Write a protein that binds this ligand. Structure first.
Ligand SMILES: O=C(O)c1ccc(N2CCN(c3cccc(C(F)(F)F)c3)CC2)c(NC(=O)c2ccc(F)cc2)c1
Ligand SMILES: Nc1nc2c(ncn2[C@@H]2O[C@H](COP(=O)(O)OP(=O)(O)OP(=O)(O)O)[C@@H](O)[C@H]2O)c(=O)[nH]1
Ligand SMILES: [Cl-]
Ligand SMILES: [Cl-]
Ligand SMILES: [Mg+2]
Lengths: 120, 996, 209
């Protein structure tokens, strides 16, 4: 790999479907923060258990903000402007849920550290 | 333009249909989808059948012709009898002609198998309608046409196979009993001629595709034909020699010989016994010489998955296990058949090593049958010693974890039987497998785990003395293995396997107090290891050991100052300090199991007091602060502490049941005050924030407190011994705390667990609280019905708990329904019928049981005005609602209970056990019996619901039904006959006279 | 890239569409919307032998929505037969689905799948499931909801169709994702869409994830 793993955590990812006004699960597996050894840019790369299919692939943009979901104390929702998991870069409203509040808070800490690395 | 074919006013353009069909089968995305919809509407047009002979003649697309035959099949199976005789003979002759024509063209026969097979099935649908009564010559003409061509002969074998399947294999659900019997007797009467042809083809041989089609039809025949066609002809010899040698015929021949092994055969005939031996000997000889020797590595062959190897090896396992399970006694007492017997078993040993779970299970079912036999049958085990030795290694190397329930059970049972048959061989294999873990040659997590599960599985099979030496040897070896291993991953794996093994040997632990004590203290040390899996395994091992050895924790052991339970309780804070909440609850549950062994009341109550010390002190300080200032609950962290206190009480109440009462009594009053305070907080959070509040972590936390309180009370009441205290102390405060709160919350804030708690209360003490049951119904009945009577989907837990509560009230306190005002009683009848329409099998089954029980409850009242008014108002509602769910094809899972309910309703009238006329006066002569009026009402109801039935069909059906209303199996037969006849036109009314 | 027609058959409500959708998008559809005739979707897996494409014909199990019925099976190269381990009738009907399927598709690899093994009250016990043995079907316990063995039917069919018993699903390398600039004109657009999404609860808040 041309990338260093900064953080790895088990997570479930959702995307908001505005039409059906509901959260639709996109995958479950290891969410990884990967630092490109050439550009030093940190991305989220998430693969599904067993199929290993990509369900998240985007830069941790400095302009993104993690917000609580009304339902959860172990989730974050954020707008992503360019995710290439399904191919052509698309904008999503994402929600990512972890096994515990501690995992979610640790994720937030790591996501901010990555935002600062990406500011350089 | 594709939609052109849906316009029936204009003649059909075959080239357009061919394009739509091509677009559907070969097109993509939106175009495929649109072609799909158009083709469905085309096929479903009730006049589309008139287009079939046009499409069959003038279409170039074989997919169009396939879809044309589907349309024809709907006409033949549903509406055939509406056609004039001339038209039916016309279709019949066209279909036969189209089949013969396709078969006589070598190019079409080779490449259009789909369309020919579909044509053959269409012909078989015609035979089901026409044959033999309106087509006596069909079989003679098929036999005749078979010598004219090898293609026609082969295709005639496909027709006869499909006919045999339709008549003998799939008739049960698809035909009336009378029509199934008719076609079975018809095929039976003409089979002599069919068999003669099949035998000639198999003898005369030559074309492999023809031979394979003939053996495919034979496989179907073997489900029903008499043994003499197999044993009194050359056919057994051909199957077990010639057809085993060529690989084209081998797979089908093996499946035939498996069904031959299942024929009904005379038991007292030496010639037949010798023929049964011979075909087996011949089959195994052809395998050994033409396929693979007994030594072959079938694991390797199967894995390589060349050609049809996997299917062949599956079929061989099915043949060997089927034949040997029936016939191995034939091979056991004759010295000249010993080699055949052991070679057959050696093939099974090789098949058992294949890495394929479902194949392994098939061979394991056989091994279970064999070793069970050797355990009980005199003078047999010695025959199989070398087979059994190899099988011990196969089972030990394939042992799965006990979480795989059925497979672990099957494996354990086989290994236990094998251990009894030779304990020394079992021990040596297990110790030598352990040695190969210790020397690293076979070391892996999977391998030490599988071995530990195997060693665990045979606990209780050795003598106590042999077990003692074996267990010490195994623990010493696993301890050495642990020391020897490096890094916490490896050590954790071996530590979990030591805990596993020790937990499976309670007899050993019970005999060796010093060992047991050390194990527990070691488990307590492991409860501080954060290394994943270790705390969970320590807690699981602790409760498993306690369940089996509890008596040893409650007595004073020699050279101890106190019962060990006192030592566990004294140090409980320290022991459990690093556990997650669910692990603490297991730990407290285990302590509850021990304490319940103490049968001295004073000493039990004191141990229970000491165990509950930490949660009771956390509780007391919260109740002081919580009541002193209510706003302290809103705090997320206190809600988590309160829920965990209640859950600890649930855990200890689960293991102590009746003995838990003094602890419940200590918290009961303040627990129900806390229920009220948390209810207020939920209510006012929903008011302030909206229905979304119920999704918030805070409100879910509060609701968790309410659900654990209801769980604690239902857990105690379900095991309570003193029901007087339940009624006098518990019930009144419970109803006051929960019923109005449930009623006066918005649907989305109502806990389905309230219904579950009330079900247990009515179940256990319903007879003793008639006024409490009335209050339960008044609080939950109408508001819960209104949540679930708009659709079948909303509030699924309320739905299930609602009908469980009505069921128990209707069983235990039916007087509560007598107290309902007429309008509420009408809603109860509506609720029952509503349950009948459900597809969810929980609700439907409770629905039908309530209806049964309610009818029984009304019958019990005898000849009084409430019973009479019930029948006048509801008898016909239950009869028509039950018939609705019987006949609409959407409620097949409820068939048995629908039938039982309908039988009860019809038998009430047939016995004259309803005092008043069911008809309102001047609707019939005033003398008229309820039997005559029920006849009339059902005839009218069925005629309007099924207008295509004749008056004769309905009258015969109802005549059969009323005569059979004391015989459930025959009654159900008549109901299933009716469900077949309503799917077609011109069902024979004489079918309802069927008798076996 | 090699594409194979896969036909999915079994009683209504057994989980055919749910199982496929989970494989296409990753989502779990809780609602029962009965299939009308057939839904066709391409489904691609990446293997150590390159990509394999299944053209998935997800057929209707309900008789009244059956459409072309066995017409859908024409030129299938593989099949899944689905039942629900919580509904005995759905297993009783497995021989009827198998009959209708193999009359059209005589020599294809077929997986039998008992779905919904996540539900505690199982009605079709392991001991009862033997139909696959004489018919040479592969069998898996699955759950579309928990993802228990969710990949196994496709992995087994891929091994059979490619003729490689050691075929594995692999991870495809993930392209470096674009760095983009948030459009100042749609910044108001996004705060709205995020408001709606923060105030709609995530489903299944009691699950391990
Ligand atoms: O006769 C006795 O009084 C006696 C007392 C304790 C014994 N032990 C059995 C318990 N034990 C043990 C060690 C580590 C883990 C566990 C586990 F918790 F069960 F996992 C148990 C090792 C010590 C054993 N059994 C042994 O095999 C043993 C004991 C001490 C040794 F140094 C070596 C062997 C015997
Ligand atoms: N608990 C549970 N529910 C499931 C599972 N798979 C599917 N379901 C539910 O089952 C219901 C029916 O699913 P569908 O996929 O629509 O069923 P289907 O077989 O396609 O139905 P037809 O199209 O009518 O043949 C839905 O409510 C699903 O959410 C599962 O693994 N577990
Ligand atoms: Cl026998
Ligand atoms: Cl009809
Ligand atoms: Mg569907």
């Amino acid at each position: 790999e041309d990338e260093e793993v900064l953080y790895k955590v088990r997570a479930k990812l959702f995307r908001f479907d505005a039409d059906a006004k509901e959260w639709k699960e996109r995958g479950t597996g290891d969410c990884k923060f990967l630092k490109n050894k050439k550009t030093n840019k940190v991305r989220i790369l998430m693969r599904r258990d067993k199929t290993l299919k990509i369900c998240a692939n985007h830069i941790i943009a400095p302009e993104y903000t993690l917000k609580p979901n009304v339902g959860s104390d172990r989730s974050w929702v954020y707008a992503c402007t360019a995710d290439i998991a399904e191919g052509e870069a698309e904008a999503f409203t994402f929600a990512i849920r972890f096994g515990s509040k501690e995992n979610a808070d640790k994720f937030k800490e790591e996501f901010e550290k990555a935002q600062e690395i990406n500011k350089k | 333009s594709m939609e052109g074919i849906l316009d029936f006013s204009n003649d059909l353009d075959i080239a357009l249909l061919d394009q739509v069909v091509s677009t559907f089968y070969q097109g993509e995305g939106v175009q495929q989808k649109q072609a799909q919809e158009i083709l469905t509407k085309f096929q479903d047009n009730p006049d589309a059948w008139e287009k079939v002979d046009q499409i069959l003649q003038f279409s170039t697309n074989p997919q169009s012709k396939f879809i044309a035959l589907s349309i024809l099949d709907k006409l033949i199976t549903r509406k055939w009898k509406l056609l004039p005789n001339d038209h039916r003979i016309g279709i019949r002759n066209f279909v036969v002609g189209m089949i013969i024509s396709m078969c006589q063209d070598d190019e079409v026969f080779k490449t259009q198998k789909n369309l020919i097979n579909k044509s053959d099935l269409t012909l078989v649908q015609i035979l089901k309608q026409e044959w033999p009564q309106n087509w006596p010559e069909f079989i003679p003409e098929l036999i005749g046409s078979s010598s004219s061509s090898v293609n026609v002969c082969e295709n005639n074998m496909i027709v006869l196979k499909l006919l045999s399947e339709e008549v003998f294999d799939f008739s049960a659900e698809q035909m009336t009993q009378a029509k199934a019997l008719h076609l079975k007797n018809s095929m039976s009467k003409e089979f002599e001629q069919i068999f003669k042809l099949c035998f000639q083809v198999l003898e005369q041989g030559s074309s492999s595709s023809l031979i394979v089609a003939t053996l495919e039809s034979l496989l179907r025949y073997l489900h029903w034909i008499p043994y003499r066609y197999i044993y009194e002809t050359n056919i057994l010899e051909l199957l077990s020699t010639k057809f085993m040698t060529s690989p084209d015929t081998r797979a089908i021949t093996l499946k035939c010989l498996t069904e031959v092994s299942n024929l009904k055969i005379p038991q007292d005939n030496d010639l037949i016994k010798r023929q049964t031996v011979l075909f087996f000997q011949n089959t195994l000889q052809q395998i050994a010489t033409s396929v693979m020797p007994v030594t072959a590595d079938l694991k390797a062959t199967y894995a390589n998955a060349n050609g049809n190897d996997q299917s062949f090896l599956q079929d061989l396992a099915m043949f060997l296990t089927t034949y040997l399970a029936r016939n191995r006694a034939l091979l056991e007492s004759d010295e000249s058949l010993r080699e055949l017997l052991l070679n057959a078993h050696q093939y099974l040993i090789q098949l058992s090593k294949i890495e394929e779970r479902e194949l392994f299970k098939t061979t394991l079912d056989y091994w279970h049958n064999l070793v069970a036999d050797l355990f009980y049958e005199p003078l047999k085990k010695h025959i199989y010693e070398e087979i059994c030795s190899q099988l011990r290694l196969v089972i030990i190397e394939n042992m799965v974890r006990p979480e795989e329930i059925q497979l672990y059970k099957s494996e354990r049972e086989v290994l236990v039987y094998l251990t009894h048959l030779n304990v020394i061989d079992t021990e040596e294999i297990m110790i030598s497998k352990l040695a190969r873990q210790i020397d690293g040659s076979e070391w892996s997590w999977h391998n030490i785990n599988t071995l530990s599960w195997a060693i665990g599985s045979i606990s209780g099979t050795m003598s106590e003395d042999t077990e003692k030496r074996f267990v010490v040897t195994v623990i010493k070896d696993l301890l050495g293995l642990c020391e020897q291993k490096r890094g916490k991953d490896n050590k954790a794996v071996v530590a979990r396997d030591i805990m596993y093994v020790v937990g499976e040997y309670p007899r050993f632990l019970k005999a060796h107090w010093n060992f047991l004590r050390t194990v527990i203290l070691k488990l307590f040390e492991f409860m501080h290891e954060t290394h994943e899996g270790v705390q969970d395994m320590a807690c699981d091992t602790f409760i498993k050991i306690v369940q089996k050895c509890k008596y040893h924790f409650v007595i004073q052991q020699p050279r101890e100052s106190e019962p060990f339970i006192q030592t566990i309780i004294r140090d409980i804070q320290k022991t459990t300090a690093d556990l997650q909440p669910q692990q603490v609850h297991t730990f407290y549950k285990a302590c509850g199991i021990i304490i319940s062994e103490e049968r001295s009341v004073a000493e039990r109550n004191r141990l229970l007091s000491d165990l509950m010390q930490l949660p009771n002190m956390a509780w007391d300080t919260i109740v002081e602060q919580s009541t002193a200032n209510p706003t302290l609950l809103l705090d997320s962290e206190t809600v988590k502490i309160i829920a965990n206190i209640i859950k600890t009480n649930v855990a200890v109440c689960t293991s102590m049941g009746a003995d838990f009462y003094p602890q419940l009594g200590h918290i009961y009053y303040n627990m129900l005050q806390l229920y009220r305070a948390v209810s207020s907080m939920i209510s006012t959070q929903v008011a302030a924030e909206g229905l979304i509040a119920t999704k918030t972590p805070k409100v879910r936390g509060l609701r968790t407190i309410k659900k654990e309180i209801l769980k604690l009370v239902e857990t105690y009441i379900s095991k309570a011994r003193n029901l007087d205290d339940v009624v006098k102390v518990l019930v009144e405060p419970l109803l006051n705390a929960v019923l109005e709160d449930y009623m006066n919350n918005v649907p989305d804030a109502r806990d389905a667990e309230v219904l579950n708690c009330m079900t247990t209360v009515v179940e256990k003490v319903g007879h003793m609280i008639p006024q409490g049951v009335i209050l339960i119904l008044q609080s939950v009945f109408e508001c819960t019905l209104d949540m679930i009577n708009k659709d079948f989907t909303e509030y699924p837990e309320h739905r299930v708990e609602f009908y469980k509560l009505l069921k128990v009230i209707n069983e235990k306190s039916f007087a509560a329904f007598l107290e309902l005002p007429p309008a509420a009683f009408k809603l109860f009848v509506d609720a029952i019928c509503w349950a009948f329409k459900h597809n969810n099998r929980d609700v439907e089954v409770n629905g039908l049981q309530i209806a049964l029980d309610l009818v029984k409850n009304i019958e019990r009242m005898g000849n009084v005005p409430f019973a009479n008014e019930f029948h006048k108002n509801y008898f016909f509602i239950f009869v028509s609602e039950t018939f609705f769910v019987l006949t609409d094809s959407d409620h097949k899972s409820g068939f048995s209970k629908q039938a039982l309910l309908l039988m009860k309703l019809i038998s009430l009238v047939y016995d004259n056990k309803i005092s008043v006329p069911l008809y309102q006066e001047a609707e019939v002569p005033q003398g008229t019996s309820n039997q005559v009026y029920l006849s009339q009402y059902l005839a009218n109801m069925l005629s309007n619901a099924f207008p295509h039935l004749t008056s004769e069909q309905i009258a015969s059906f109802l005549s059969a039904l009323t005569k059979q209303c004391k015989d459930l199996v025959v009654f159900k037969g008549t109901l299933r006959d009716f469900l077949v006849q309503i799917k077609e036109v011109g069902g024979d009314p004489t079918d309802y006279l069927f008798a076996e | 890239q090699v594409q194979f027609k896969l036909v999915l058959v079994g009683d209504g409500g057994t989980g055919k569409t749910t199982f496929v959708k989970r494989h296409l998008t990753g989502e779990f559809e809780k609602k029962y919307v009965a299939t009308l005739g057939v839904e066709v979707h391409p489904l691609v897996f990446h293997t150590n032998r390159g990509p394999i494409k299944f053209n998935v014909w997800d057929t209707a199990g309900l008789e009244k929505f059956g459409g072309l019925r066995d017409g859908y099976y024409i030129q299938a190269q593989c099949a899944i037969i689905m039942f629900d381990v919580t509904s005995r009738v759905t297993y009783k009907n497995v021989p009827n689905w198998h009959r209708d399927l193999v009359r059209v598709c005589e020599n294809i690899p077929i997986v039998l799948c008992g779905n919904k093994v996540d539900i505690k009250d199982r009605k079709v016990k392991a001991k009862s499931i033997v139909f696959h043995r004489k018919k040479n079907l592969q069998y898996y316990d699955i759950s579309a909801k928990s993802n228990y063995n969710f990949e196994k039917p496709f992995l087994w069919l891929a091994r059979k169709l490619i003729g490689d018993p050691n075929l594995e699903f692999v991870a495809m390398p993930a392209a470096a994702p674009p760095e983009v600039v948030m459009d100042p004109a749609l910044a108001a657009q996004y705060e709205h869409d995020l408001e709606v999404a923060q105030t709609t609860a995530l489903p299944d808040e009691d699950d391990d994830l």
